[PDB]
Amino acid sequence: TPWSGYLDDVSAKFDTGVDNLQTQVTEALDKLAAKPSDPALLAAYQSKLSEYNLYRNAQSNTVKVFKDIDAAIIQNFR
C-alpha cells in the first residue's frame, strides 16, 4: 500500500494546489523551442518559468521546518 506520512501530506498540498502548472511549463517550453523569436511566447514562458521557480522553493523550505520541529520534540523523550 502506498504509505504517506505527515510531511508527505504537507508537500502534497502544493502539488494539488497548482492544478496544471507542471504541464503548462512543458507545453510552453515546447512551443517556444520551435520558434524562439515570438515575443508573446517569450513573455509567457518567462512568467510561467518564474511561477514554477517560486513554487518549489516554498515547498522545500516549508518541508524542512517541520522536520526540525519534530526532531526537537523527539530529542526530549529521554
Partner: protein, 51 residues
C-alpha cells in the same frame, strides 16, 4: 497401581507439552470481479484514494 498411573500420566503430559499443533495453512484465493490493488484518483478538489 495408583502410584504408577499418577506418575505415567504426569510425565506423558509433560512430554506432549513440547509439541505444537497449530499448523498454519496457506490459502490461495482468486478474485473474479475486481482489481487487487489500491488506486488513486486525482480529483481537482482532492487527492483521493480507494483501498
Amino acid at each position: 497401581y495408583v502410584d504408577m498411573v499418577v506418575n505415567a500420566a504426569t510425565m506423558m503430559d509433560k512430554q506432549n507439552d513440547g509439541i505444537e499443533l497449530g499448523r498454519q495453512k496457506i490459502g490461495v484465493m482468486r478474485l473474479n470481479n475486481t482489481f487487487v490493488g489500491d488506486r488513486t484518483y486525482n480529483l481537482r478538489d482532492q487527492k483521493m484514494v480507494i483501498p
